[PDB]
Amino acid sequence: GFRKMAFPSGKVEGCMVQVTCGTTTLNGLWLDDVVYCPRHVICTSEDMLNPNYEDLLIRKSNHNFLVQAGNVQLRVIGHSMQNCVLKLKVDTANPKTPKYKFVRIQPGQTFSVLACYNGSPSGVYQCAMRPNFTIKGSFLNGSCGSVGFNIDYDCVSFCYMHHMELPTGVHAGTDLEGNFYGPFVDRQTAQAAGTDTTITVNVLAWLYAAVINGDRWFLNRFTTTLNDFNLVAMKYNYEPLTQDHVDILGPLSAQTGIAVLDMCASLKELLQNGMNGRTILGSALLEDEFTPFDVVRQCS
């Protein structure tokens, strides 16, 4: 079978806390003796439209930040700002702090989101960083500070923290250094993204997964050159496929005996002809939020 699968979220759940300043409440990430959260928690209504964050932050005291881990209040003993994230230093270390690191992911890469409200985890799902640096998340009011992550062995690699929804309903945020993905800004304004494109190497991975699970109606007898495929792919607002992408698809190619450029010829036919009512792995649309690695691990 094949499902959109998230990493188990327990190691991240034990880091989540609630952070309040004024009448604003969102989530923080508690690692060792530091809590990370979106800086716009210091903003009032009158601040949110053009917040001069350095100016607003210097006027705040440690005691203006109310941090709660379940029943317990954590005492803030210092605060600083790193780009769009606030670092609240606390007098107590999180014992549940896992082995972790902070990474900035590339567009087309995937990661799990642990959506939280008032510091309590509510759900977990899988996302990709879109080529236009938005994410198609499920985030309501109160979800800021929810984080996205990958787990390699015993290590949690944090790659996203949530800050906002765009008018189109997609979402935008930062890495754990507080740098936004994309051309967005932590002010209360309607912001449009650049035109999105489809993550081709991931569509190809998913087609291979469909074959591994017995679905093959979209295959064809034809091949294509890499450049002629890319010409068609760009026409349809699909990302170009690089030779590194081709190399990454090798394992999936070997396992199934379908040359990458044969699968590209299939995808080209799907783009030109559409799906003619049919479905692949349940979907009526071509899915682009599985990486080759995602498909490999899940299918062995």
Add this chain to the structure above:
Amino acid sequence: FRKMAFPSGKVEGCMVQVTCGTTTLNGLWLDDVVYCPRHVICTSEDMLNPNYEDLLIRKSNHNFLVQAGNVQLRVIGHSMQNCVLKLKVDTANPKTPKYKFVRIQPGQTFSVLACYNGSPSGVYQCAMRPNFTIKGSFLNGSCGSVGFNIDYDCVSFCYMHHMELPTGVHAGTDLEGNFYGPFVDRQTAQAAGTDTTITVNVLAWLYAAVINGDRWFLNRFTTTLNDFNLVAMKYNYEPLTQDHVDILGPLSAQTGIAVLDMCASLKELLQNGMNGRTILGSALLEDEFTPFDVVRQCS
């Protein structure tokens, strides 16, 4: 709308591995009991048609290797309940959540924590199909992985994984060891009944579309429940039960559209098709979001 799983940490803290000879699967460690599929006691060649009672009579506590990670939990008692093994262990799980064992209905959804050798690998959302299979993602060694829902702080355990069918869907039991559907834990070819579309969930999905301002498909007609069920079966949709009508209640109230009026709108979509339009960015009607799922993501 995403498929969203429950946070899995409370269940991760309960996963262990259980080994008999070379056969290793997963178990669920709550208080001082470990729950797992009984077929752990079967050699690969025993699985063709096992005599579970006779295989268990030859077993002693000291034939069972239970491990949390690499740490052995000594087994101090054992009993078979339907198709699961209960192994009493000498340590109460310090991470035991508040929990319940529940038997769910077809159509209901739940999160699966896929595990191998006692270690969680992934979590995803499943629906229990009307033919009592699930469209899971499971490899060798996944048995004893569990499906669950979390209400407030209480984990309601509803599924334990035992097997894959010829069509590549999956079958298992509740935590009392009773299979969902007409399957047995024997390495024999078995067939699921023909599957049907989960009508209550499709209706939930239509409510979700209305809540988001997508309401072209609403019409001025209504229907009886019986007339709707008889029409729906002709399109291989499940009949609605009284419980289905009940769990659509909150979405009915939220939108002010009576359940039976939404049924009349769906009947017209069945009878006339989408005429080329979409609902919620899709020509397909989705059937694996329950009314609870719709609430979790809209409000």
